[PDB]
Amino acid sequence: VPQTVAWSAKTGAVMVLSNILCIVAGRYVIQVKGSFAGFGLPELLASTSLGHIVGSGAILGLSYVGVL
Amino acid sequence: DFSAAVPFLKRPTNLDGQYIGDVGFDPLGFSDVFDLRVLREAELKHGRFAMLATLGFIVQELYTFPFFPKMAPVDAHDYFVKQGGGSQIIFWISFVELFGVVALFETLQGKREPGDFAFDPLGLAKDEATLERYRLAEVKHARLAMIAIGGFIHQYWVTKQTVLEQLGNF
Amino acid sequence: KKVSITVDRDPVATSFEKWAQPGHFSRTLAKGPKTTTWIWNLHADVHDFDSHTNSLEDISRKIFSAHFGQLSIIFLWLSGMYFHGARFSNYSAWLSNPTAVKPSAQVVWPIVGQEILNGDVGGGFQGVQVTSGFFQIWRASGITSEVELYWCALAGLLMSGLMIFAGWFHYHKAAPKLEWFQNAESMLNHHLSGLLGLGCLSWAGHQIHISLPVNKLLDAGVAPQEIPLPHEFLVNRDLMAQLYPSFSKGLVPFFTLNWSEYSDFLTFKGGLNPVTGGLWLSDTAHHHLALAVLFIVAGHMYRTNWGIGHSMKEILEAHKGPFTGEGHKGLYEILTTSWHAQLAINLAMMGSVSIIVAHHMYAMPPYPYIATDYPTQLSIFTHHMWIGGFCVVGGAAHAGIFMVRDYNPAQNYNNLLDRVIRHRDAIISHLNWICIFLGFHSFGLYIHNDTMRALGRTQDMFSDTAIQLKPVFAQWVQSIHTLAPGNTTPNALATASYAFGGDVVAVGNKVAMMPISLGTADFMVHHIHAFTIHVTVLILLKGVLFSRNSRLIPDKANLGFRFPCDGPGRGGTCQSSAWDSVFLGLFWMYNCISVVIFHFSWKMQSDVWGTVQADGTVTHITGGNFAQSAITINGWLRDFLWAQASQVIQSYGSALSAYGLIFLGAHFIWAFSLMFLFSGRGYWQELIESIVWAHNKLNVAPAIQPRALSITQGRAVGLAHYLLGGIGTTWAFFLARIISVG
Amino acid sequence: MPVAIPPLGRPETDMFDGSVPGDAGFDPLVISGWLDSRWLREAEVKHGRVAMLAAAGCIAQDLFTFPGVMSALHDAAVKAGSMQQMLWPIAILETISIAATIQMLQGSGRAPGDFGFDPLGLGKGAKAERMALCEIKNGRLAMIGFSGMMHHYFITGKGPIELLTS
Amino acid sequence: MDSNFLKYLSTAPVLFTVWLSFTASFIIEANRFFPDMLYFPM
């Protein structure tokens, strides 16, 4: 079984970083919606949902490879 | 506008008060899809069965015919399944229910009220106002006995005691 | 918003008037019969909604409500199976002794001696043995009593009533508008995330919370009556944690991404459960949970009222290259306007999925005690193979219907459809050549082997003891999949299936699964399969691509999808429609699926299924005769057809005698079909003229003038009785053989 | 008009027209602009009334118990079957509230949180609007207050007033 | 009873199915109460 870790501040840091990266990426690449003008609740929900998806994948992968 | 019984619900459009006992109570909207004549015939039939059932639980446990063994009414269903009286009662109810089918077809043609079987041999309703008053009384007793018969049967299933002994202790 | 709910209220009055007017839906048919042909026409075009009206909205409403009606029928059927399992089955005795009680959920009444069909099925029970696999499904679901089966039957009946009410409501009371139906993105989002995703998630919930503890107690040897009820597994976390200790940790490991804590009930074991011979239920629970996550993620792809999401029209129009002109442009309009194109795609996909189900369900048995239930395995493989073949040919048929009816060349200029039509001759010619090549170099190997074995030259045959045709690629793939645990799937304990290689998983002295080796005979029969599939594709694709016109008939689209001919001219134009191509492709599908199921039956009986005895040797049902006999047609005739039909022809006077009767009756219906297939309409019309004279002589000629069946109806009736006869013959033969010997 | 936070201003939605009771100009995520107004108002009033009953319950049960014997009370009353017997009438009342909220979203004359119930007559006339404000303010405070008493219980296994006096 | 429903019940497939089921039920009940009648007893 691949090693997963208990919740810590590192897990929170990775999740927060992935969420913020996905929020900025969603600001830049979403075609149909000063830089945060037009920023609405569905776009925030989509970006934070991708942020949990990317953060979960990154946390599981870094726990797999030993970076924790 | 709104229902007379439930003040925060709108009045169902097909509940205009033509049927005695109407307080505009239909939150699931059964009258919006189904024929109200059929629903009222079903309500009165279910209720009259339940009224006779509750009176039967009271009398049939107070008194029992000498030509029958003594047992509880719920066990009496299972006994008369095998003895053959229950088949006789089911047969005669079915026989009357064939003319009930004919009466329901007459109701759907608009030639008969949804509860009118023209059965008043003792002449108890003389004039109109008495008939509306007894209609409201019958509808209320029908609904009340429909709740009460389920109460009787389920409480016997849990306590294994009849109504009148359950009244004496707890 | 753009995606919204638009509904018309009370569009069609609920009335019995049109029930008394047969043919009301068609202006041609509403005039009433004058000939008997009308009657056939009344049953032939009735659910062909687009030919009754041109309004897409009314067609869509009819389709939605008919789908509700089909769902009601399916729910009634399921409720029937649950009820007949509850009341007329030996399911409790089977739960106590799965390896020795034959499943049976049908009991016949004694009338004319048919009570002999109530065979001694074990468990103190007499009935007809059933092979649908419902007992194994209910054991996998954790159903331990017949009371639960009664409640399941009630749930099925209630859902059937709900579906039929929904059909009446959504046609006759509140019919959605055309704009509601034309939301492909919203429908895909809801059906991917809500239907498949939440369905997988809730079934994973049932598997984790109900199926795993009950089946763990069953495999440990606990009697079904002493197993706790499922709600006790729900509320007593200590009882759950006795079997899986990670349940003591609750839902904290899920939300904190400490998922490995759940490794005791979410596993990646692979292989099979040694006690039951089925897949590990923990593996299935992780599987359905992972599928739920993937499906819910996939259900957020497509654009809806809010700005996020993909637009499928943009995706299609962006994918275009130098070989393909305008590319995938115009396909979104086709697939949002033509119901027949969607039916073509979905029927093709559902058929391919059913075929995949048959392969993957024999090879990795998913239910407890289903692997050693050989009649169930053979029945479900054959059944889902047949359903798959029928649905694939139906996808081709409704593709041809789209091409004749709904195709518009103005909206299809230089896109992929237009370019496919414009090089149809190259496509069909290359497919024709590859079909002839496959036929020669696959079937002529069998003919060559027949001749060599008949001429006494065994060293000149294609066999493993002779000139060899080794299936090296499939053997290499088998070696890879055997070497995969620990190397390319390092966290899997065992192989995905033991059919690729490994140990002999045996349950109750019967082989659940063992390696399925591939030799010269397997090479020849897989290339026979490739030949038959390519020829079926040739027939169906030639019919679809030449449905509108050809060099023979330049105005074929004006004649329609379904016409008998364009007359004896041009040399003869018989069977020129796309419908007739579907008619021939159904025969070739029958041939293909028949060879596939024969290969399956012989290979499993010869090399996989059997009894395990002392020193670990496996005695197979036919003793390994496939390697030397399946290389000739004589070997298929003698060692498979002649040898294994002994059980169905000696079934008279036993419980399996119904299979012998159905065997004879299916041979009869198949032969009866050849009267319709080989003959023509004019003979029967003149014979009917003479019979009409006979009835006219006695003044008993009918007012509805009797006519011979139409040419298309002659073909359709011959094909229907042919398929029924052949499939019924294989049905009776398979079932009698595998019930007797397995 | 009350501007809760001056840099972000007052959201331009169907809500914050000023007719809705209890508006402070506070909706920074602008959830009102994406979900219906009456649904959110009904949700707020129902959450507030349930939390008011909950906080009053925590205080009153810690003061006194009905004759005959927090989260442990939920577990022990489920084991007693009390919670099912309290789920059943609440379930009935909530199925009629399903009906009422469906009609209100369909556009009937019912205001959100209004169940037509005023036996004392304290609402009739000019009071109710202010009372509505009072209700919603108390409702919001209840959602804070109970949220203390449970999590505090999670720390101590102790009731909030009994924690306060100890 | 609705005349249109009766007219639907009078259609050829419904009446065919009902009449053939009725005939089949006669044959089945006759063979249930008097089985194995290879011959007319004389």
Ligand code: CLA
């Ligand atoms: C910090 C970043 C980070 C790191 C280090 C990792 C690291 C890892 N991830 Mg991970 N991941 C990340 C971010 C990260 N991920 C993000 C952001 C996501 C999105 C949510 C994912 C989603 C993800 C999934 C869903 C999975 C992983 C898995 C893995 C492990 C891969 C094991 C392996 O060899 O692959 C396997 C290598 C292969 C070659 C296998 C092939 C896989 C399939 C069967 C083939 C499908 C391709 C198909 C044929 C189509 C190709 C045809 C084409 C021509 C069209 C590895 C430890 C896997 C895992 O945990 O396994 C235990 C796994 O299932 N990751």
Ligand code: CLA
């Ligand atoms: C999450 C929402 C959702 C779900 C679950 C479905 C589900 C379904 N749709 Mg669908 N649909 C949706 C949204 C949804 N749709 C939307 C938004 C649109 C408009 C764009 C459509 C438009 C649409 C059309 C036009 C058609 C369907 C059809 C179907 C059925 C496919 C056949 C099948 O597999 O049935 C078997 C699967 C089942 C789950 C059987 C049970 C059926 C009931 C209705 C499920 C209800 C579940 C309920 C929501 C939650 C209760 C479960 C539990 C908590 C008690 C299936 C029931 C087809 C059909 O057959 O219509 C009748 C069809 O023709 N849908």
Ligand code: CLA
């Ligand atoms: C999702 C499934 C599906 C759906 C909804 C449709 C829908 C449709 N198809 Mg299609 N089709 C399908 C699957 C489907 N098909 C498959 C799988 C095939 C391949 C066999 C075909 C082959 C096909 C052809 C070749 C044609 C259609 C046609 C039609 C249209 C009218 C059908 C009609 O009125 O028949 C009314 C219903 C009947 C006549 C009942 C048929 C009864 C069958 C033949 C016998 C059943 C025997 C039974 C199973 C076992 C009996 C044994 C017992 C006696 C012992 C309609 C749009 C026709 C059309 O004109 O389209 C424009 C047309 O020409 N389809």
Ligand code: CLA
């Ligand atoms: C056993 C009966 C039988 C046989 C042998 C064939 C043979 C053939 N059919 Mg056919 N068909 C049949 C029954 C049969 N059909 C029936 C019952 C139907 C009714 C629905 C159809 C409907 C049908 C359609 C609709 C199509 C075919 C097609 C084909 C061809 C496939 C290409 C191929 O395999 O080339 C290889 C040839 C063979 C396997 C034939 C046997 C030759 C063997 C190998 C020995 C050769 C020895 C040599 C010639 C000896 C010379 C001796 C000298 C004295 C002459 C082929 C000519 C397809 C076609 O023509 O396109 C490709 C096509 O589209 N058939």
Ligand SMILES: CC1=C(C#C/C(C)=C/C=C\C(C)=C\C=C\C=C(C)\C=C\C=C(/C)C#CC2=C(C)C[C@@H](O)CC2(C)C)C(C)(C)C[C@H](O)C1
């Ligand atoms: C419709 C209608 C009617 C009505 C009505 C009803 C049912 C009236 C309901 C009135 C209520 C429930 C009023 C408000 C309660 C507010 C609370 C509990 C909020 C927070 C408490 C906190 C934070 C606390 C506390 C604390 C304390 C003290 C102690 C410790 O624990 C610690 C802590 C510091 C946390 C009637 C029938 C009358 C008729 C009328 O014509 C109209």
Ligand SMILES: CC1=C(C#C/C(C)=C/C=C/C(C)=C/C=C/C=C(C)/C=C/C=C(C)/C=C/C2=C(C)CCCC2(C)C)C(C)(C)C[C@H](O)C1
């Ligand atoms: C199987 C079996 C048998 C049996 C049996 C039978 C007959 C079993 C049970 C039957 C029935 C009818 C049960 C339920 C009855 C009524 C209920 C629940 C009413 C609730 C009313 C409420 C909540 C009112 C609420 C309300 C209130 C307060 C006022 C406002 C309105 C409303 C909101 C609606 C035998 C013995 C016959 C035969 C055999 O041997 C075995």
Ligand SMILES: CC1=C(C/C=C(\C)CCC[C@H](C)CCC[C@H](C)CCCC(C)C)C(=O)c2ccccc2C1=O
């Ligand atoms: C036999 C045959 C017929 C004759 C079939 C007749 C016309 C159809 C018979 C249908 C019957 C009347 C319906 C069902 C028959 C039942 C077994 C008994 C009759 C029931 C009556 C009450 C109608 C064709 O018309 C035909 C047309 C084209 C190619 C081949 C053929 C062909 O082979």
Ligand code: SF4
């Ligand atoms: S034989 Fe029949 S199908 Fe062929 S051309 Fe003549 S009429 Fe048409």
